[PDB]
Amino acid sequence: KWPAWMDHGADGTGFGIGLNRTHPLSKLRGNLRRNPSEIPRVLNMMIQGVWHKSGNKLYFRGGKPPNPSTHPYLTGEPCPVYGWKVTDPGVIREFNLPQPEDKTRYKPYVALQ
Amino acid sequence: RFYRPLVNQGINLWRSRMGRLHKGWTTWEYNRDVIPDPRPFPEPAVNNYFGRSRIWNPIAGKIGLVNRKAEEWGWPHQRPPPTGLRRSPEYFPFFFSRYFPDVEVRLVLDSVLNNETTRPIFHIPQDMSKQELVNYLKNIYNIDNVVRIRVRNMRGRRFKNEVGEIKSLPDYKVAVVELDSPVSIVFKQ
Amino acid sequence: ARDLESHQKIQIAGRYPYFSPDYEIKPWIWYPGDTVEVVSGEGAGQRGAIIAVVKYKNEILVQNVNVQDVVIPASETRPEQVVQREHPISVLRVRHVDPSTNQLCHLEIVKVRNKETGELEERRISLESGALLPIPAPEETVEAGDPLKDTAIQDADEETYDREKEMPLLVVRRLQAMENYFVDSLQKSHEYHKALQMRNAQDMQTFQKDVL
Amino acid sequence: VAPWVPPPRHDVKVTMPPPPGGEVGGSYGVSTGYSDRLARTPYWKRMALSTYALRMKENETRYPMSPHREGEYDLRYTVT
Amino acid sequence: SHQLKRILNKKSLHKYNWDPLHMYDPRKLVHANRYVDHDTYEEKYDPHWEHNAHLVPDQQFYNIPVPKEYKDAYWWRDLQARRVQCPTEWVHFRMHTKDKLKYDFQDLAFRKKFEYSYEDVVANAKDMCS
Amino acid sequence: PKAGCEEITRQGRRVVLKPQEYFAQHRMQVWQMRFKEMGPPFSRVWVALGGKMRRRRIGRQIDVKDMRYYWRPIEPQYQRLYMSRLRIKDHSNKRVQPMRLRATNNDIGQASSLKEWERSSDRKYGAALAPPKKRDFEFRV
Amino acid sequence: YQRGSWAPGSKHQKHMSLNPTMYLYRFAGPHGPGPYVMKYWWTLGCFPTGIERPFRLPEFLASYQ
RNA sequence: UAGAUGUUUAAUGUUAAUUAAUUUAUUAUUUUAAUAUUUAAUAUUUGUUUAUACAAAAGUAACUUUUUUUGAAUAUAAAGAAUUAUUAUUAUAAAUAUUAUUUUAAAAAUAUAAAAAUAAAUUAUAACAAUCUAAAUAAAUAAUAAAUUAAAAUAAAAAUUUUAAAAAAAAUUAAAAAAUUAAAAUAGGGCAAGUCCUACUCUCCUUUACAAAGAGAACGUUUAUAUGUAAUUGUACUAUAUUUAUUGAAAUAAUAAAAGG
RNA sequence: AGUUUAAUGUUUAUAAAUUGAUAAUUAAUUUGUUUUAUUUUAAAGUUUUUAUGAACUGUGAUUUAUAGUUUAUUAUUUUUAGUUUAAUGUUUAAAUAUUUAACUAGUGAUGGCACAGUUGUUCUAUAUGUACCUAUAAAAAAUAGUAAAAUUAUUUUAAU
RNA sequence: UUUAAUCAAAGUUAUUAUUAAAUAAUAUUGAUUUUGGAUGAAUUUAAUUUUUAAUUAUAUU
């Protein structure tokens, strides 16, 4: 039901294949779900990976199992032109907080007499 | 009353006729109705393993939400936030994220000691992507000479305490940020 | 993760018993400076004033009572050093030296006013003589603080919270979102229902025609 | 989950509880009727909204028969 | 594999997804039996309509009012809404013991009946001076 | 079970009181039609009908010296064999006697006359032996 | 099969069908850790079977505390 | 000495009404699960030298800080026969790396392996040579009622003989042989019944059925009916009869259980 | 650690039988505040109800020619490192290993998918279905009613 | 230095604990962390049968 490039190849050698988590606010459709119907598939990407017919395992080559939870949220779909066509900067938590130091600063700690 | 089944064949002793088989398991005797336990004993659903192959359980729990209910809005007492606000960037748990970020970018002091390195290394949390880190150096530390950020998602380090109880340090990520200028640390010497 | 041997816990439960829930003594009546005498065990009957209390352990450090030699192993700098020092003794085996009767006397936090009590309450009542006692405060650190990193008490006292130009602004950031999804919840209320009422408004038309 | 648990079938009376289901169209399986609105309504209220002439008109008995299913025995008073 | 034995046992989140109704969409019956005014070509307001309405329950919508005459296609989603959303075998404990008498059970709705407090039963039996 | 082990850690089935037997099992229907025990106590003899049983062809020309219909007591061994099934109601008690073959009115009385039955108005005083109550005439099912 | 006892530190022969063992290289006998399973306890850290757990406490109350 | 004519335990025992000498009558030969022997001075271990290709699944006893890409996210070593064991786990790619584990100073049997004779590669060969100590270290296995023996002769019991009896005079130790001791009332013929087997004419409970009735029989179902062995079963006037007709057969060549020689 | 037939009958207080039946009565004459629950231990073939199993060994269906050779022959006769057998091994390097022994020449096949126990595959061996085909897993009782084997306490007092 | 060779094992050990089992009539949407994630059908277990519902006698048939 999700963007099929997450399932099969968007290219020759399977660039998009993997599990993807999306911030609950953006309209970018992800593939990670914890429904029981979807777990025998989600677990294989953790414990086995994917064997693209091109002869290169994509989502999981070596030993440590990827953690589908802490994957940073989805931000685009891969075009054959760039690595990614970034589709929603609304996920990127660009830290837009400024700080002054001029007047009545607030040290990280506070003092008692 | 129930009247027990009877097993003393003798003068009558003709179970071959009306006698229906009462060898059928004796439900009446075990009548204590509390379920036995399954002979292949299902282990506790807690994950015991702690080594480097600690996988993440996909199965979505029940009490998990019922605690994230009461931690975004008092669940049994206060009423649910309207969904227009609940699914909005103004929903407090999401509100406290666009104006009050909470990350931990711990640079390894071991990396840039007396030596001079143009590639510092950071123990960033696992949620933070490559871009999300650059926008974190340029806005909070005003470090704006990044070239390329690599990613080595490393599992946190285990250890056993003095008793010998398995413990672990929260997972992190190693991001080899390619700087433009050789940076060091002038250790007072 | 694995458990310990049976005999292993048995040794580790007796060492650290306070790990139980609420190991402390339900009212805490032993304080530094109290006048207390031991009762039973080693040296039954000596009198000495408390100097420190280990609350979570139900024990007491008392002057000259149960004194032992705290050996101090040291590295190549200092030699093996020995130091005498009285030891934590359990409060279960000591009782108070009543400042008048100098006998056994239990001591309960008490409430209710007798003779112009400041909070209209006594703070530690002796049963035999009746002269109460106070319950002091444990000391906070006086010489703590980093002047290069500690905001002075005044920059923590500059009230900048004018709730009449931010809270009226918050309620806009919230109400915009509510007014959005609600009218956005009128898509299926319109993009689905409008089609049905057409098969009605297209029926009156084809009903008006037929009669004619 | 169920937003808005539906109300009972025939709680038209003000004092006596509604009849069991099936009788009024539902699922057979209980010989009682329980209107939570009727119980939570206190006594001084339940007697307020009625008069003696009316109380003797919903305590009304049809014991050998059903007041809702014509020709049918009172399935409040049957074996099952 | 060692982990998969003692993590696949965790009870996944359950709820009572009750039967969807494709063939009988009950939402498009607020436009049934609606008089249409001639000049305007729209459903003039029928104040009598909302009282021949059998409010059908629903999981995404509170209750959908349907004209009585088409109510019988939705007799299941009625009996599925009364039913306690749990399986019975988890709330069985309210059915076998002597709390059988203190619990509603119409349509397997394992919900509690009204119970007097312990302080009320005191006063409600002293005011009878018994 | 030692103190605590996987055989006691877990929880197999559990066992409750065993239901009893019919109180008068050992007066088996097959004897209550063959014999009748007669005589005073300490002289209980079990007489059974005497004489041959064969059903010949149409012969049997004498019906008068046919079976004399006499009760003659069974062999002394077998009386002890059956009666042995009767004593085991309360073994180890020299006090009690053998439970009789056919019921007696004190047995039919004492059975439902205990304290525990004192309020069981119906079935008291042998209601199950009397002819039934004349049922109602407006009775129906 | 199964000539001795059923414990892993038993004395006579056994079989892997009746009494299937986990392959434990060297564990402690019934009379305590001899000087062979302690060559690990001071180098490997824990007994070499991996199943036993390294209660290194009373040494910590010997040196550090 | 001691009640008696011999098989249903003795108890205020630190009064489960006590508080400093209770010195507590208490133990099941074997089926239990723990330890300890004996086999055991042992069997097996023993590390000084060979010729290098790539995947995946496979593990994760596991660490990492150090350059994955210019793709964002993700992940980069480790097995399986229980093992660090008889082993190139080879789908693919390959061709001049000395690319890094094998004790011992004796002798036999055996085990591998080896010049000469009654045109070929063979023989058999249970023939030289060659390899396999000991001690040192490490240590298992099945087995175990114990002996006071055990050399050697020699008779005695439904008996088969473990013993006992007379008569002898039989010493330690290591090594090597297996003569004796520690592993079934059996093998072969000759007969007769039985199970197995085939075969139906007559036997029993088959169900799956088919037709019949019933509905103006587009079909769905419920009763009444004898078919196949479908297929399982089993079948040696006081007298003087009766309790058995009720499936029938085949060297059914092999099995079984008996007798007989 | 280890095996279960109540060695006792004190005041309220009263317990008989008999016909095949109706019934009949010198039914002679007891006992009892009503006494009830117990019946070894271990232990075979088996049954039964649900379940699981093709990573093993069984038979499909997708591989359409990384090797040397005899005969003109594209068949071939072959090659044969793939094919029904004999010794050693004897808790053995292996809970079937190394050598010995009996024929077929991949344009039709290494698993795709599929089958499962009162029954699969079946090239029809009552062979094989994960190191004992009594398949495995779970729960249970009729299962030594069977030369079965065990059954805890000396000093005694009646016999065959 | 000589031992001719042999012959014996009897009767006590530290420093830390409060767990099991039965009993009790007053809880209860599944024990082991944050669903779906498209805004939808994943998270459905219902049907008149000794059932987690468990029965004060010895007669008659």
Contacts of C98 (CB under 8 A, 6+ apart): C105, C126, C128, C129, C131
Q: How many CB atoms lie within 10 A of CB G9?
A: 11
Residue E64 corresponds to which tokens in the numbers above?
Answer: 């959908």
Ramachandran class of C164: left when φ > 0, alpha when ψ lies in -120 to 50, beta otherwise: alpha
- In terms of Cβ atoms closer than 10 Å to its own Cβ (0-12, 13-18, 19+), residue B10 is exposed
Q: How far apart are CA E83 and CA D26, in angstroms?
A: 12
Closest by alpha carbon to G47, among B164, C72, E42? B164
Looking at strand I, which nucleotides approach a protein CB closer than 7 A?
Answer: 5-9, 15-20, 28-32, 34-39, 47, 91, 95, 131-132, 137-142, 145
Q: Does B127 touch chain F (CB under 8 A)?
A: no
Q: How far apart are CA E107 and CA D5, in angstroms?
A: 12
Q: How far apart are CA C57 and CA C23, in angstroms?
A: 7
Q: How far apart are CA A24 and CA A9, in angstroms?
A: 25
Helix (H/G/I), strand (E/B), else coil: B147: strand
Q: Does C155 touch chain A (CB under 8 A)?
A: yes
Instruction: Using the structure, give the distance in angstroms from the CA atom of C104 to the C1' atom of H113, rounded to a whole number.
Output: 102
Residues written for chain E: 130
SS3 of chain F: the string is CCCCCHHHHCCCCCCCCCCCCCCCCCCCCCCCCCEEEECCCCCCEEEEECCCCCCCCCCCCCCCCCCCCCEEECCHHHHHHHHHHHHHHHCCCCCCCCCCCCCCHHHHHHHCCCHHHCCCCCCCCCCCCCCCCCCCCCCCC
Q: How far apart are CA F81 and CA F94, in angstroms?
A: 19
Nearest CA in chain C to B168: C1
- The b-or-e profile of F91-130 (16+ CB within 10 A means b, else e) is eeeeeeebbebeeeeeeeeeebeeeeeeeeeeeeeeeeee
Show residues of chain B in contact with F86, CB under 8 Å: none
DSSP string, B72-109: TS-TTTSPPPPHHHHTSTTSHHHHHHHSS-----EE-T
Do C33 and C52 contact (CB within 8 A), yes or no?
no
Instruction: Using the structure, give the distance in angstroms from the CA atom of A28 to the C1' atom of H146, rounded to a whole number.
Output: 89
Do D29 and D38 contact (CB within 8 A), yes or no?
no
Nearest CA in chain D to E86: D1
Q: Tell me, what amino acid is at D45? A: K
Instruction: Note the helical H segments in chain B.
Output: 27-30, 63-70, 83-86, 92-98, 130-140
Q: Cα distance from B49 to chain C (closest Cα, Å)?
A: 6
Residues written for chain C: 212
Say if the Cβ atoms of E107 and D36 lie within 8 Å: no
Do E41 and C201 contact (CB within 8 A), yes or no?
yes
Closest by alpha carbon to C128, among C99, C157, C91? C99
Residues written for chain B: 189
Q: How far apart are CA D8 and CA D17, in angstroms?
A: 10
Q: Does A36 touch chain E (CB under 8 A)?
A: yes
Closest by alpha carbon to C7, among G37, G38, G32? G32
Q: Tell me, what amino acid is at C142? A: V
Is chain E adjacent to chain C, meaning 3+ CB pairs within 8 angstroms? yes
Q: How far apart are CA C6 and CA E2, in angstroms?
A: 25
User: Residue B75, CB half-sphere, CA atoms under 13 Å: how many?
Assistant: 10
Q: Cα distance from G65 to chain C (closest Cα, Å)?
A: 10
Do C68 and C83 contact (CB within 8 A), yes or no?
no
Helix (H/G/I), strand (E/B), else coil: B130: helix
Do A73 and A83 contact (CB within 8 A), yes or no?
no
Q: Cα distance from E6 to chain A (closest Cα, Å)?
A: 14
- For an interface test with C, the pick among E6, E25, E28 (most C C-beta atoms closer than 10 Å) comes out as E28
Closest by alpha carbon to D44, among E129, E102, E127? E127
Say if the Cβ atoms of C181 and B83 lie within 8 Å: yes
Pairing type for strands A51-52 and A56-57 reads: antiparallel
Looking at strand J, which nucleotides approach a protein CB closer than 7 A?
Answer: 15-21, 27-48, 51-60
Do D68 and D10 contact (CB within 8 A), yes or no?
yes
The experimental method, as deposited, was cryo-EM
Do C39 and C94 contact (CB within 8 A), yes or no?
yes
Give the count of Cβ contacts less than 8 A between chain C and E: 25
Chains contacting A (3 or more CB pairs within 8 Å) = B, C, E
Measured between alpha carbons, how far is residue B28 from residues A3, B31, B32, C44 in Å?
Answer: 59, 5, 9, 64
Measured between alpha carbons, how far is residue B27 from residues B152, C171, F7 in Å?
Answer: 61, 67, 22
Residue B11 corresponds to which tokens in the numbers above?
Answer: 């003068």
Contacts of B52 (CB under 8 A, 6+ apart): A63, A64, B155, B158
Instruction: Please list the helix, strand and coil fractions of chain A in percent, rounded to the nearest 5, in that order.
Output: 15, 10, 80
Closest by alpha carbon to A90, among A8, A34, A14, A26? A26
Closest by alpha carbon to C179, among B83, B142, A85? B83
Looking at strand H, which nucleotides approach a protein CB closer than 7 A?
Answer: 33-38, 55-78, 82-83, 140-143, 237-239, 241-242
E12 closest CB neighbour out of A36, A43, A47: A36
Q: How far apart are CA B181 and CA B147, in angstroms?
A: 10
Chains contacting D (3 or more CB pairs within 8 Å) = E
Q: How far apart are CA C132 and CA C145, in angstroms?
A: 37
Q: How far apart are CA F125 and CA F118, in angstroms?
A: 11
B45 closest CB neighbour out of E7, E13, E14: E7
Q: How far apart are CA B178 and CA G36, in angstroms?
A: 51
Do B156 and B170 contact (CB within 8 A), yes or no?
yes
Do B152 and B122 contact (CB within 8 A), yes or no?
no
Q: How far apart are CA A88 and CA A77, in angstroms?
A: 10
Greatest C-alpha distance within chain B: 110
Determine the straight-line distance between the first and last CA of chain A, rounded to whole angstroms.
63
Contacts of E81 (CB under 8 A, 6+ apart): D2, D5, D6, E18, E57
Helix (H/G/I), strand (E/B), else coil: C88: strand
* Secondary structure letter of residue C188 according to DSSP: I
- For an interface test with C, the pick among G53, G59, G61, G65 (most C C-beta atoms closer than 10 Å) comes out as G53
- For an interface test with A, the pick among B47, B52, B54, B59 (most A C-beta atoms closer than 10 Å) comes out as B59
SS3 of A73-97: the string is CCCEECCCCCCCEECCCCCCCCCCC
Q: How far apart are CA A92 and CA A76, in angstroms?
A: 11
Q: How far apart are CA F16 and CA F7, in angstroms?
A: 19
Say if the Cβ atoms of F19 and B30 lie within 8 Å: no
Contacts of G5 (CB under 8 A, 6+ apart): G11, G12
Say if the Cβ atoms of B127 and A72 lie within 8 Å: yes
Q: Does A42 touch chain B (CB under 8 A)?
A: yes
Q: Does A111 touch chain C (CB under 8 A)?
A: yes
Is chain C adjacent to chain G, meaning 3+ CB pairs within 8 angstroms? yes
Instruction: Point out which residues pair with B46 in neighbouring strands.
Output: none
Q: How far apart are CA A73 and CA A30, in angstroms?
A: 9
Instruction: Note the helical H segments in G1-65.
Output: 38-41, 57-60
Residues written for chain G: 65
Backbone φ and ψ for A26, nearest 5 degrees, come out as: -95, 150
In Å, what resolution does this model reach?
Answer: 3.4
Is chain B adjacent to chain G, meaning 3+ CB pairs within 8 angstroms? yes
Q: How far apart are CA E65 and CA C53, in angstroms?
A: 72
Helix (H/G/I), strand (E/B), else coil: B142: coil
Residue E30 corresponds to which tokens in the numbers above?
Answer: 């607020």
